[PDB]
Design a protein around this ligand. Structure first.
Ligand SMILES: Nc1ncnc2c1ncn2[C@@H]1O[C@H](COP(=O)(O)OP(=O)(O)OP(=O)(O)O)[C@@H](O)[C@H]1O
Ligand SMILES: Nc1ncnc2c1ncn2[C@@H]1O[C@H](COP(=O)(O)OP(=O)(O)OP(=O)(O)O)[C@@H](O)[C@H]1O
Lengths: 162, 109, 585, 195, 171, 576
């Protein structure tokens, strides 16, 4: 029940900082009653199918995801640097996009990965020994990264009977 | 693609065009087997009551080889398929073109 | 007027002036209509890329005169918008303000030349000031034509440039007053070093500044800057090369006024102030990573209270304390270096500059005669820590006596009589002479120094470690707890009501008030001091009751003052008395 | 861990690339002792008056749903990668020389294994010839040459060569009465990079 | 995509050589082959010249597009080729390798040809990256093949598209 | 001539390098350097003989010019391949070359007037080198008179918007310790480095060097630069920061890791000549490996490494063991007589108070000393401090730059009168306990008698001490081999894994330390007369080290029974 991949369930787990609009009951995994407004972390599976118009919880984004960095990184779409404080960053909106109520995120994501349509000019080889640039990585670009390394490493073997 | 191949085949079970019989032999053999292997996981408590699909996607960009009129022979395809040729290509995906290839008008590489 | 594209560039920075965003906001009610007159407009490169990318990244690739074109356009604009304040006929440099490339002082490395970029490092070498020579409205009574001649140098723009016997031999009275002047400055930065590979030496930089930007912090803080690169002199055309930096606005990154402080955050503070049993929380706030004090270390983090008289004298307001065998006393002071402002550790083995200078200079560019700084004035209006105290020499101790107790530093380095205002506190660490010992022989003489200091300090005190066979499993329980979020919600808490950031933000108002004494402290303090000097020296404690003086009063009043700042009760009570005094007993 | 271990589950085969000592049936036992611990709650409140028909129970439904998702699909991986790598070496030989052990057959896998063997049975029947010539397809690629001689190799074990020799000792110095039909299985399992 | 898979494509192409025999113990195989007699040319595919030249039976000579002059003017045509250039048989990067491997016991000028063919190879390859630094807006109805070859394009094939589709879906 | 070189020879040389297998070029290497911003290239010096037989014998004599004809050929051959079409040479760029060889190393004592303006090869050692100021190539030395109404006598304004910029670092070299310093001390030399080789050599390493001995102004001055540096292979002479290790090396490494007979193999690794002393040795090797330097949201940067102790009667091979621990990633050694002060001196140039800074020099290395005993207390307090917080402070003059360094430490000793103290009570140390407390290991040495041991230590040493014996039969033992492996293996293993404990280890360790402290207190009460956090926070580091060994992140307390039975030695040593 998904767009599978070997990352079968690095898929619906990304945790958020959702707010509260009105009350709920019996939080279960965390009172059959609560207040209007108490910040709470939540996974993505059960929220995946609870009706963006319906309002138990609120317009809700994380802070790296909040529009300030994301705007100035569709302007810093030249060296927005990643690391591993948020390793995957490439199809989050491919669920989360419509839940903002301020329609911002899809264009950001597309520009970022259109920069990979601009970026991988360079990543075309395995020149020598093992590992070169192996921690600025979402682990979906890592797939095609290894793949291109493979195709070049074998194309090398083509270049003569070698 | 053992999942919804069967839906087209139960749409008609085409003639020698789409599939061959021994493949269907295989398909039913395998579809039965996975369940009788799932036997020793959850079949005293197998499900009590659609979503398992594998190979549906029809937009993986491929490379075309035209073989036709050097002008733009316009045919059944969603996009602006303009500028068809005799030795050339303007790249496209597969949803919009599963039509020319069944005519053997065009080719892949 | 050089290459003709320069004027296209002038109009292209005018092309920022289209509509409401800049034609409405950024020009007009911006400095002079609002009448602050801080000439430097506020630029943000991102909007420039969002309007003119060729003029955005033309700037962060070259700055030959684009600054000057910005200034030309600004004066052309304001001359139309409001010519009344168009009477400052100079360049009017502007922002360039606002993570494209933010390498360290260690990596300002053979490129970025001709670029405008970012640096971080230490506020350091807060240094000397001079004015600058611009242009002067000369005059000749023989002819009575007030001519002019502008002077340049490379550190202001590209080119390089007084008149006597000008035309044929007529008069020249150089008229000042209408001759103008900027302000000038020079200092440096060092890498905030803890990113270092300590197999290497953290490297350095060189920075120059200009007029309305001058001398904006003290050496010993952390800072950000964003500036450009220039390199003038000979380089085997005559001898190699050098660096300097300009083109910037200042950014300090350790403040609270940086925070958007409206009337709501104060409102949360004053709401929650009504909660009484918060002292025991804030004690358990400071050191969430360690038993064990900090109820009062807090008060040390509140400076103190200053009290003066008409045209008489003044006192020092702050507190200083310390008490212990080895194995969590040499790891409880790094809750100061990186919890709260102006915190500087010192060594325990370092001489000649705790407050000394040595005043050494060697033929400066100007006539710098004699001065260097110390290590206390850096900590004015705050705190100091040290490790390894008792092993310090018996040289500089008396300087500590003086500058602590007298609350002023009025010293001389054999050339110049000196005076300043340093009104700080200090800590250190502790070690007995013979290791694991404070109890069987005596409580005193296990420390081994003058009995004058406990007047200068406040407390004769005690600190040890072991337990018998019943509670040893209880310390096992706590040690295993030390070795999540469960049951620290039995500790009814939040990571925003108890934290670092909000905890820091309760500095401003607790230090802005002046919680005066009422009267009902008086009889209590008097009767208590009576009992204190009477019967603290009996029942196994006779020799540990020597250092009493009439100094427990100024400490008590420091204490009730500080405790009156942590909830802002503009008054003082008996409950404050108890919470302030129970330590001494 | 709460749905992570399958990358740990194949780690019995971490070394087993092509120098494989042997293989085992790891990582099912406590892991499907789970599933009968949880169905109780997964169907506890089925159309019940436990909450009198109210909206709040929707996390429970999806809890069951995602639990099934993770369980079943890790099962698909523990099935399919085993079959696939074994299918690689089972293209490198028929059931002439089967697995190193045949002790790590996770018990129901008899059906699975042998069905795929009968995949190749169908393959042989239709392909090769209509009646079925089992078409020599991935091993014994000698051009037409002699039928009976032995040669040198590089120390394989498993010792399953039942084909047409008395005892050939299929290792380095499997050097004995080897016919062609005896030696009909090997090209790459770790044997004859060197004649 | 492999180093040899496309030799099960490309090696079927044809050249023309001279063997040294009369007709063999069998004379001719029923097919497009011509008759076998020494001292004269015969036209063959390329899955034998491998088998033949090292079987010490015959000589071998190349097609005409292998030279210096034609492959010294095609490059200066290629320099202004804002799109593509001349294409001698369209899988000519592999016939060269399988010729210059064995054949050079008798072929002439067996290095400078390598020089020029790589000098065309690299320039066209670096061309086939700059399509990408202009390929905007998901333009999946507009691209280049016009006089492209095959032995380069497998050096891109699994990298870009396999992710490009499910990525640039947004437009 | 200037051009006949670039006209054909260098320009076609790179183009012509041909071995089938279609690798043997410097073209593809140049491009795959170019793509990733590197801007360099390497060559040997005996490949040109594979191209010609003259140019090399001209490369030695006039190198300074040839090594720019190379740069011109390099860029004019490389910018043709920059061109995808005429539309992506955004702009050209300059490169630097490297050359290497395997000819023979020399010594500093032969660098004289004849070996000047000429290529060389040497092998030395490093102390320190400068910072990174600047130097450039051109802009818009003698700058003559003419001007270009008058404009007089040299009015030249540099236009440094239009100047350029390359690097500058000034490296250093001291000799090796086996080329007649015997009746002398070792001399040394200062150097020069140009564009891409700053941060290529930290001080404290073994070098190969390719350089040139040229001057700046008849008593005029020396200096040298790099002409394509390379490095040393004293086992792994230079394998200290970078990685030319390959997947083969990672493969061999991790294939050694899972081999579960490596640790008891490695307890016999250090001494191919010494007998016995194995429980002493099971944690002289873990000291290298180190555990975890876990900082937290509060202050507690808790103590990362571990520390060693030993004191014992002479005659048990202390010195050779510590010299060996120095020998086998980076470290240094003194013993006594040295500091409590650090280095606030003054360069007589400019008269400032610079900070030269040598526990600095083990910030990833380690340190070993003997004689904490016979060096008195004026220099023990700075080292009291350093090895518990690593924040080496400074407060002398107007600077408070409390820098830091992460170092461990190893301690030998000598007690008076042998085991006279060690039988009876409180003369273990004569000085104080808080550097006996602040350590981890507690390993005493004795030399007790027994005739079997006597006769065995007799013949065991003779076959060792007979005619440089170990040519053949040392490595033929099981796995006790190759310190070079140990160097590279450590510099992997320390720099990857971030291990930490399980659940089950914690309670068992707490109960065990509880019983330890209770036994100490009972010895206090069972004698009517007289247990730190440091002991727990150190013994945890041996679990850290072991998990570092086998490369498993998470380790067990049953895995660590060995460690706590090592600490048992300490416990029953300080038994009294
Ligand atoms: N209650 C506690 N709170 C915080 N840390 C603790 C506690 N108990 C033990 N520790 C840890 O144990 C170690 C104690 O060493 P510490 O730094 O206190 O020595 P020290 O008091 O500086 O020694 P000396 O006073 O002789 O210089 C520290 O690493 C500390 O983190
Ligand atoms: N257990 C041993 N097995 C083999 N050889 C030994 C042993 N102990 C000592 N030796 C020999 O003696 C020498 C070691 O003596 P070492 O220098 O350790 O004494 P030391 O510990 O320095 O004495 P002190 O501590 O009093 O200075 C080595 O050179 C070695 O050849």
């Amino acid at each position: 029940p998904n767009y599978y991949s070997i990352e079968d369930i690095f898929v619906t787990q990304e945790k958020v900082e959702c707010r509260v609009n009105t009350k709920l009951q019996r939080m279960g995994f965390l009172s059959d009653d609560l207040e209007p407004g108490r910040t709470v972390n939540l996974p993505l599976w059960y929220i995946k199918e609870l009706k963006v118009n319906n309002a138990y919880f609120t317009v809700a984004v994380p802070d790296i995801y909040r529009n300030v960095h994301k705007a100035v990184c569709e302007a810093e779409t030249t060296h927005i640097e990643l690391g591993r404080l948020h390793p995957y960053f490439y199809e989050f909106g491919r669920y989360l996009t419509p839940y903002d109520r301020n329609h911002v995120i899809g264009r950001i994501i597309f520009e970022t990965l259109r920069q990979r349509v601009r970026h991988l000019l360079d990543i075309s080889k395995s020149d020598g020994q093992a590992a070169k640039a192996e921690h600025r990585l979402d682990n979906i670009e890592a797939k095609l990264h290894e793949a291109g390394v493979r195709t070049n490493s074998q194309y090398i073997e083509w270049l003569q009977m070698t | 693609f053992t999942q919804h191949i069967l839906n087209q085949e139960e749409s008609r079970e085409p003639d020698d065009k789409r599939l061959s019989p021994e493949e269907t032999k295989f398909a039913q053999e395998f579809a039965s087997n996975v369940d009788e292997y799932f036997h020793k996981v959850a079949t005293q408590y197998m499900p009590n009551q659609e979503q398992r699909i594998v190979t549906p996607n029809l937009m993986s960009h491929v490379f075309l080889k035209a073989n036709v009129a050097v002008p733009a022979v316009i045919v059944g395809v969603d996009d602006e398929e303009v500028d068809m040729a005799a030795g050339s290509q303007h790249i496209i995906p597969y949803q919009l073109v599963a039509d020319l290839i069944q005519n053997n008008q065009a080719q892949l590489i | 007027e050089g290459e003709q594209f320069i004027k296209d560039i002038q109009r292209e920075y005018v092309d920022f002036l289209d509509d409401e965003e800049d034609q409405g906001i950024y020009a007009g009610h911006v400095k002079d209509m609002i009448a602050e007159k801080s000439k430097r407009l506020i630029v943000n490169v991102n909007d420039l890329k969002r309007k003119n990318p060729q003029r955005a990244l033309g700037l962060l690739s070259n700055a030959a005169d684009e600054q000057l074109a910005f200034g030309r356009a600004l004066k052309e604009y304001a001359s139309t918008v409001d010519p009344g304040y168009a009477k400052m006929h100079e360049d009017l440099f502007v922002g360039f303000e606002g993570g494209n490339r933010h390498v360290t002082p260690r990596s300002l490395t053979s490129i970025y030349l001709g670029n405008m970029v970012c640096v971080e490092g230490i506020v350091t070498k807060v240094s000397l000031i001079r004015p600058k020579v611009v242009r002067s409205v000369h005059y000749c009574p023989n002819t009575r034509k007030v001519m002019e001649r502008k002077y340049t140098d490379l550190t202001s723009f590209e080119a390089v440039p007084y008149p006597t016997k000008d035309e044929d031999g007529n008069l020249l009275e150089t008229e000042y007053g209408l001759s103008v002047y900027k302000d000038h400055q020079t200092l440096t930065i060092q890498e905030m070093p803890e990113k270092a590979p300590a197999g290497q030496l953290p490297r350095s930089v060189d920075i120059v500044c200009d007029d309305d930007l001058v001398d904006r912090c003290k050496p010993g803080d952390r800072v950000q800057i964003v500036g450009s690169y220039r390199c003038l002199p000979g380089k085997r055309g005559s001898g190699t090369f050098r660096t300097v930096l300009l083109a910037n606005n200042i950014s300090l990154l350790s403040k609270e006024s940086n925070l958007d402080i409206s009337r709501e955050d104060i409102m949360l503070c004053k709401k929650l102030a009504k909660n009484n049993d918060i002292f025991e929380l804030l004690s358990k706030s400071l050191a969430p990573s360690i038993g064990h004090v900090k109820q009062a270390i807090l008060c040390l983090l509140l400076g103190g209270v200053e009290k003066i008289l008409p045209n008489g004298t003044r006192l020092r307001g702050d507190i200083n304390v310390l008490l212990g065998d080895p194995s969590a006393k040499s790891q409880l002071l790094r809750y100061v270096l990186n919890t709260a402002p102006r915190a500087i550790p010192t060594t325990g083995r370092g001489s000649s500059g705790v407050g000394l200078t040595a005043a050494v200079t060697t033929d400066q560019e100007t006539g710098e005669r004699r001065l260097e700084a110390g290590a206390m004035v850096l900590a004015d209006r705050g705190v100091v820590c040290i490790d390894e105290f008792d092993k310090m020499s018996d040289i500089d101790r008396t300087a500590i006596h003086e500058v602590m107790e007298q609350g002023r530093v009025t010293i001389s380095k054999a050339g110049i009589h000196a005076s300043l205002n340093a009104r700080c506190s200090v800590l250190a660490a502790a070690n007995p002479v013979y290791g694991r010992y404070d109890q069987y022989k005596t409580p005193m003489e296990n420390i081994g120094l003058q009995d004058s200091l406990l007047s200068r300090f406040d407390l004769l005190f005690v600190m040890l470690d072991v337990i018998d066979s019943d509670v040893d499993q209880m310390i096992s329980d706590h040690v295993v707890r030390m070795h999540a979020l469960l049951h620290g919600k039995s500790r009814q808490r939040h990571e925003k009501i108890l934290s670092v950031e909000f905890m820091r933000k309760y500095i401003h108002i607790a230090k802005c008030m002046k919680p005066k004494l009422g009267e009902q402290a008086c009889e209590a303090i008097a009767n208590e001091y009576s009992r204190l000097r009477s019967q603290e020296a009996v029942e196994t404690d006779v020799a540990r009751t020597q250092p009493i003086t009439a100094r427990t009063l100024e400490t008590l009043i420091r204490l009730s003052t500080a405790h009156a700042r942590a909830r802002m009760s503009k008054s003082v009570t008996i409950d404050d008395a108890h919470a302030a005094i129970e330590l001494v007993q | 861990m709460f749905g992570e271990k399958a990358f740990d589950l194949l780690k019995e085969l971490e070394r087993s690339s092509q120098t494989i000592p042997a293989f085992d049936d790891d990582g099912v036992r406590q892991v499907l002792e789970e599933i009968k611990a949880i169905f109780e709650e997964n169907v506890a409140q089925a159309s019940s008056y436990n909450a009198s028909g109210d909206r709040s129970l929707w996390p429970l439904l999806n809890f069951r749903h995602a639990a099934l998702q993770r369980n079943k699909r890790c099962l698909l991986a523990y099935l399919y990668e085993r079959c696939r790598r074994i299918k690689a070496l089972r293209w490198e030989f028929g059931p002439i020389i089967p697995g190193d052990i045949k002790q790590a057959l996770c018990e129901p896998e008899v059906t699975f294994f042998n069905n795929y063997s009968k995949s190749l049975a169908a393959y042989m029947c239709s392909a090769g010839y209509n009646q079925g010539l089992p078409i020599d397809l991935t091993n014994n690629l000698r051009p037409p040459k002699s039928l009976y001689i032995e040669v040198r190799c590089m120390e394989d074990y498993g010792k399953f060569e039942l084909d047409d020799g008395e005892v050939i000792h299929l290792k380095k110095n499997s050097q004995h009465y080897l016919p062609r039909a005896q030696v009909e299985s090997l090209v790459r399992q770790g044997i004859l990079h060197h004649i | 995509m492999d180093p040899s898979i496309i030799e099960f494509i490309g090696e079927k192409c044809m050249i023309s050589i001279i063997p040294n025999f009369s007709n063999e113990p069998l004379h001719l195989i029923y097919g497009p082959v011509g008759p076998f007699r020494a001292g004269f040319p015969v036209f063959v595919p390329l899955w034998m010249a491998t088998h033949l030249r090292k079987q010490q039976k015959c000589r071998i000579v190349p097609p005409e597009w292998m030279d210096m002059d034609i492959l010294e003017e095609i490059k200066e045509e290629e320099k202004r080729s804002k799109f593509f250039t001349k294409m001698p048989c369209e899988h000519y990067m592999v016939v060269a390798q399988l010729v210059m491997s064995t054949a050079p016991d008798d072929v002439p000028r067996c290095e400078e040809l390598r020089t020029v063919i790589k000098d065309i190879f690299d320039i066209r390859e670096s061309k086939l990256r700059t399509s990408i630094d202009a390929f905007i807006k998901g333009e999946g109805t507009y691209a280049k093949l016009d006089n492209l070859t095959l032995l380069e394009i497998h050096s891109v094939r699994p990298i870009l598209p396999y992710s490009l589709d499910h990525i640039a879906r947004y437009q | 001539i200037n051009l006949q070189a670039v006209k054909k020879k260098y320009k076609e040389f790179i183009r012509t390098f041909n071995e089938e297998n279609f690798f043997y070029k410097y073209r593809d290497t140049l491009k795959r350097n170019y793509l990733n911003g590197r801007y360099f290239l390497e060559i040997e010096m005996e490949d040109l003989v594979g191209f010609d037989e003259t140019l090399a014998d001209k490369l030695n004599k006039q190198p300074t010019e040839h090594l720019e004809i190379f740069e011109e050929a390099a860029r004019e051959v490389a910018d043709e391949i920059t061109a995808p079409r005429p539309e992506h040479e955004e702009h050209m760029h300059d490169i630097q070359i490297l050359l290497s060889s395997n000819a023979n190393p020399t010594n500093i004592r032969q660098l004289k007037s004849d070996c000047v303006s000429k290529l060389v090869k040497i092998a030395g050692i490093i102390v320190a080198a400068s910072g990174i100021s600047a130097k450039a190539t051109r802009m818009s030395y003698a700058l003559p008179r003419k001007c270009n109404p008058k404009c007089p006598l040299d009015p030249f304004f540099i236009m440094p918007d239009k100047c350029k910029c390359v690097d500058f670092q000034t490296l250093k070299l001291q000799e090796l310790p086996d080329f007649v310093p015997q009746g002398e001390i070792p001399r040394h030399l200062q150097l020069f480095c140009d564009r891409s080789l700053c941060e290529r050599v930290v001080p404290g390493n073994r070098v190969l060097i390719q350089g040139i001995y040229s001057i700046r102004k008849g008593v005029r001055a020396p200096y040298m630069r790099v002409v394509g540096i390379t490095v040393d292979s004293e086992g792994a002479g230079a394998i200290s920061r970078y990685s030319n290790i390959t997947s083969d090396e990672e493969e061999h490494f991790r294939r050694m890791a899972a081999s579960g007979d490596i640790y008891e193999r490695l307890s016999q690794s250090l001494a191919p000549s010494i007998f016995g002393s194995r429980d002493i040795k099971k944690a002289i090797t873990c000291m290298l490996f180190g555990g975890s330097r876990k900082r937290l949201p509060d202050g507690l940067c808790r103590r990362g490494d571990i520390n060693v102790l030993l004191l014992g009667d002479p005659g048990t091979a202390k010195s050779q063991l510590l010299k060996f621990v120095e020998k086998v990633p980076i470290a240094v050694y003194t013993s006594g007589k040295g500091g409590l002060t650090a280095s606030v001196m003054k360069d007589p140039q400019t008269r400032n108070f610079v900070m030269e800074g040598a526990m600095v020099l083990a910030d990833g290395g380690v340190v070993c000393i003997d004689e904490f005993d016979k060096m008195r207390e004026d220099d023990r307090v700075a080292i009291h401090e350093a090895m518990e917080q690593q924040t080496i402070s400074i407060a002398k003059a107007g600077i408070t730059t409390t820098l830091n360094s992460r170092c461990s430490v190893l301690a030998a000793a000598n007690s008076i009168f042998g085991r006279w103290d060690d039988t009876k009570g409180e003369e273990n140390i004569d000085f104080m306990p808080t550097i006996l407390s602040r350590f981890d290991m507690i390993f005493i040495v004795k030399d007790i008698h027994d005739e079997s041991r006597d006769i065995t230590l007799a013949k065991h040493i003779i076959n060792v001490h007979l005619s440089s014996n170990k040519s053949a039969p040392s490595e033929p033992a099981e796995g006790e081999i190759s310190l070079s492996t140990f160097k590279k293996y450590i510099h992997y293993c320390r720099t990857h894994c971030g291990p930490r404990l399980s659940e089950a280890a914690g309670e068992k360790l707490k109960s065990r330390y509880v019983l330890m402290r209770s036994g100490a207190g009972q010895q206090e009460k069972a004698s009517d007369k007289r247990i730190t956090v440091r002991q727990l926070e150190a013994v945890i580091r041996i679990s850290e080290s072991l998990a570092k060994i086998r490369l498993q992140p998470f380790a067990t307390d049953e895995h660590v029974n060995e460690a706590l039975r090592l600490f048992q030695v300490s416990t029953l040593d300080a038994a009294m």
